[PDB]
């Protein structure tokens, strides 16, 4: 018995086709992704193959003005038009609180929404009953396939789920669900969820009964053979994990932003054991036509976003690299621009820290350098503030160690900086990787970089998200000596670009590796 | 027979009293120098000692809006009121060309103006004839004292003396003059000139018959004992040179900007040989009152200078270090500010690299006056009225410019480069012309700018002053090897427009220049 799995993850409000770097589509002839194109490819597979499932591994919420304006209503409408079979909750599904998940998405979706490790309590428990499920048993031809869902246990530190939801350990909560399916004679089981590639391999190894793992969160690109675009593979597609019960478990992910459609063909025996598997993500480029009916519908919804002011805030003569491949791994000029904008607005304090997890999109310079509100909203969508904090040298050293404590997994805590020169040695054990930390003096007439002192006190400008312990920055929230509310994030950056008129941020050696 | 030599050098238009860093006077209670205070000190010494000479070793011209507006007429007027006995020509006396030296200074000074190594040719020979002299024999009581002048051989690369003036080697030109003085029965000889401390010491050692050397140009601070202010001594006052003809020759200098009055008391024998010498520069601080007559006259002349729009151009929240002790020796934030203003103004109407000679940065700016920056504060930093131009350069040409930048490091010369979009590391222990150990530059043929090592065979677009594109400060490799040269915007206007745009400025020392 053969099953075809079609899968998307971390679409992040890319409803329309985009530029290859997943920023706004300008040169339409070379544009990729979007739901209109995705529908054409999905229909080509469904008409050719008998047993097909279309799955989403979370983070459809947040990314463009489509979500700023429609707040998830666009997600339910277009995922329904594409006839997704199941979706697992991501951390971004909680960005507008529980109320912002229930009303636009859970009540309007015509497909099951899954998460086995999220438990509701108090008054909310009765209100959210049946709105999301731990699993779904789906008929596929004359057979049945069990799909078990999971969501990152880190969601309370990344989003707004509130106090009436408990995030259990993924492996602990998934085992009673898989066991229940096996007692119900469901021999084919897919683990679909949003925790990242490292947790996906752990679920494949330790959750007895799981046949295939379909994940997201880490924007992992897997490929077998010569890759078709700029994404570099982290391993082969699928990635094979040998479980603790000696079975080969395929693990898959399909990058992010709807650029690719994941495609895996599984050969099962009569007892639901995986005999073999093969496939690859499919690049959704201009050679695949956008579906005419979906496009016409996308255009109708686009009218409300078209009333947004298309006025030029300013110009860039350089590419503004806000890609996660850069800003979560190294110094990126978008990070330097925002940290310099933060310092400049406040002086109208020489040090700045900014998590890569907060930088959500790059900005292209080829459209006569024009920067609009729409371009900026995709970079800074959370509506947070840039606040003043007083920190000890020891707290600052702890935040920089946390910045790289699990380097290489594409996590949000990596820090972009202003008025700070940091050197990291990744060969050293976690918590002892900062080899050099020089900061700009304040008690000096002429500013210059001096070694950080553990017993000294520093004034830093950072997002209110980090002062509140976001991205696991617990040492900031617990040890800060002062915290003053600042100006709105996007407004600080638009004001800076308007004053400067022409911007040119560079990678100047603020972050170095040994 | 006893003689007291009072001496100034590199006053650089500091007519009014200044802040101790020699920028604008704001907190008057702590202000120093100025001609009014100098007059009180000179008057105190003249009434105490019968045999006194007041000498200037050049570079009175250029430094503040006093020179922008009065163009040397303030120099002649106030040097006459102080009754200077003689002055040697400096490089800055040629900033407004030969016509700018002849009309307001040579024609109005009531004292001799000297230089034994400058020779006139062409039609100027007849025009300038006798306006400046190789020497002057001065009566001092019952005796006579010979004073021979000299000017830096480097002046054509630093100023505008023109094609009709020839600069000879100092030692070659001075010896025939000193020998002539001996035949004229002049047994006491002072060499007064503007070539720097290293040349002053060579003059003392090799020019037979010279008794004392009074110099300038290098802003050298000499002192015996504990110094009274922030200047660090380069040696004792006086510095003693053992001459080739077997004598002890004192060499003196008195820093710059009229902050100090050089004071040297000499004991001569009957044949004009130095028996002994002692003194020190006198710090002209608040303990010496300003002469009321000179002060009133200074206030009268300042009326026309206030007409300069006192409108706040912008604000600084940091000290703007444009001092020579910094910008001629290491990375200074005033240099970073100017190079950033040069790149920003050019990108307004892709050029990522900037070079700027420390010799072009003429004053710091203080942040304590509510951070206010005016046209007067700026005109003291950039007074030459030059432009910031676009040039195309080979990687080899740029590497050579950075080698020339540190080829004779430690003499406080102007060729040291301040940078923008460049990361340079020097190792001074190495031979000259092989001191540049690291040179990284910002890419231009990239979507994201980043630092990459310089390539000898590569071609770069640099913003620099027109002065450097024309071989100023000895940058012959720039003038001779550049591939393109476009005219730019006025230097001072580029910096003021940037400050007005930014509103609040805070330049830092970031590690653009490093030493190994
Ligand atoms: N503890 C805590 C905590 C404090 C504040 C918030 C505020 N908040 N409510 C919903 C979304 C946001 C929000 C706001 C701002 Cl300004 C953010 N910058 N980055 N970032 C982000 C989002 C996703 C990932 C993935 N990995 N890292 C991430 C970081 C942001 C989330 C949330 C939680
Ligand atoms: N070769 C040649 C050459 C080319 C151009 C000029 C222009 N020029 N005419 C008079 C004064 C200036 C002038 C203009 C500008 Cl913008 C200058 N920046 N620095 N600097 C300077 C002056 C003094 C010292 C001492 N040491 N280094 C110096 C450098 C400047 C002089 C002069 C000569
Ligand atoms: Ca199975
Ligand atoms: Ca003698
Ligand atoms: Zn995501
Ligand atoms: Zn996620
Ligand atoms: Zn001088
Ligand atoms: Zn000079």
Curated annotation (Swiss-Prot), chain B:
Family statement drawn from the similarity comment of this UniProt entry: Belongs to the 5'-nucleotidase family.
Q: Which domain of life is it from?
A: Eukaryota
Report the EC number(s), separated by commas if there are several.
3.1.3.35, 3.1.3.5, 3.1.3.89, 3.1.3.91
Identify which cofactors the protein needs according to its UniProt entry.
Zn(2+)
Q: Binding of AMP: at which residues?
A: 328, 357, 362, 384, 467, 473
Q: Which organism is it from?
A: Homo sapiens
Query: Where, by residue number, does Zn(2+) 1 bind?
Result: 10, 12, 59
**What name appears for this protein in its UniProt entry?**
5'-nucleotidase
> Could you say which enzyme class this protein belongs to?
hydrolase
Which GO terms fall under molecular function for this chain's record?
A: 5'-deoxynucleotidase activity; 5'-nucleotidase activity; GMP 5'-nucleotidase activity; identical protein binding; IMP 5'-nucleotidase activity; nucleotide binding; thymidylate 5'-phosphatase activity; zinc ion binding
GO biological process terms, semicolon-separated: adenosine biosynthetic process; ADP catabolic process; AMP catabolic process; ATP metabolic process; calcium ion homeostasis; DNA metabolic process; inhibition of non-skeletal tissue mineralization; leukocyte cell-cell adhesion
Site residues by UniProt (Transition state stabilizer): 92, 95
Activity modulation: Inhibited by adenosine 5'-(alpha,beta-methylene)-diphosphate (AMPCP).
Give the disulfide map.
Answer: 25-31, 327-332, 339-354, 443-446
């Amino acid at each position: 018995w053969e099953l075809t799995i079609l899968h998307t993850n971390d679409v992040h409000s890319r409803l329309e086709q985009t530029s290859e770097d997943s920023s706004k589509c300008v040169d339409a002839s070379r544009c990729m992704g979007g739901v209109a194109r995705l529908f054409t490819k999905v229909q080509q597979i469904r008409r050719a193959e008998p047993n097909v499932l279309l799955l989403d591994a979370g983070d459809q919420y947040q990314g463009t003005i489509w979500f700023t304006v429609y707040k998830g209503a666009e997600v339910a409408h277009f995922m329904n038009a594409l006839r997704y079979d199941a979706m697992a909750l991501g951390n971004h599904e909680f960005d507008n609180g529980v109320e912002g998940l229930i009303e636009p998405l859970l009540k309007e979706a015509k497909f099951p929404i899954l998460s086995a490790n999220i438990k509701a309590k108090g008054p909310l428990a009765s209100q959210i009953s049946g709105l999301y499920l731990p699993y779904k048993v789906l008929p596929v031809g004359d057979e049945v396939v069990g799909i078990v869902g999971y969501t990152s246990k880190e969601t309370p530190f990344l989003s707004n789920p509130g106090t009436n939801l408990v995030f259990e350990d993924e492996i602990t909560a998934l085992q009673p669900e898989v066991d229940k399916l096996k007692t119900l004679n469901v021999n084919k089981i897919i683990a679909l969820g949003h925790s990242g590639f490292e947790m996906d391999k752990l679920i494949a190894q330790k959750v007895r009964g799981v046949d295939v793992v379909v994940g997201g969160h880490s924007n992992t690109f897997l490929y077998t053979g010569n890759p078709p675009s700029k994404e570099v593979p982290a391993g082969k597609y699928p990635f094979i994990v040998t479980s603790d019960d000696g079975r080969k478990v395929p693990v898959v992910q399909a990058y992010a932003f709807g650029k690719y459609l994941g495609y895996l063909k599984i050969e099962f025996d009569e007892r639901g054991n995986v005999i073999s598997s093969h496939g690859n993500p499919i690049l959704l480029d201009s050679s695949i036509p956008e579906d005419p009916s979906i496009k016409a519908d996308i255009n109708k919804w686009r009218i409300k976003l078209d009333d947004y002011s298309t006025q030029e805030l300013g110009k860039t003569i350089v590419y503004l690299d806000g890609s996660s491949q850069s800003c979560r791994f190294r110094e990126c000029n978008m990070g330097n621009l925002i940290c310099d904008a933060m310092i400049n607005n406040n002086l109208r304090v020489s040090m700045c820290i900014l998590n890569g997890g907060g930088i959500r999109s790059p900005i292209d310079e080829r459209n006569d350098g024009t920067i609009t509100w729409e371009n900026l909203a995709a970079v800074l969508p959370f509506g947070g503030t840039f606040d003043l904090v007083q920190l000890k040298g020891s707290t600052l050293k702890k935040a920089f160690e946390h910045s790289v404590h699990r380097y290489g997994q594409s996590t949000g805590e990596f820090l972009q900086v202003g008025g700070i020169h940091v050197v990291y040695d990744l060969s050293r054990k976690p918590g002892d990787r900062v080899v050099k930390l020089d900061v700009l003096c304040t008690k000096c007439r002429v500013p210059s970089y001096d070694p950080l002192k553990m017993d000294e006190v520093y004034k830093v400008i950072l997002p209110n998200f980090l002062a509140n312990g976001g991205d696991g920055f617990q040492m900031i929230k617990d040890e800060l000596l002062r915290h003053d509310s600042g100006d709105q994030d996007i407004n600080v950056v638009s004001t800076y670009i308007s004053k400067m008129k022409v911007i040119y941020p560079a990678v100047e050696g603020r972050i170095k590796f040994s």
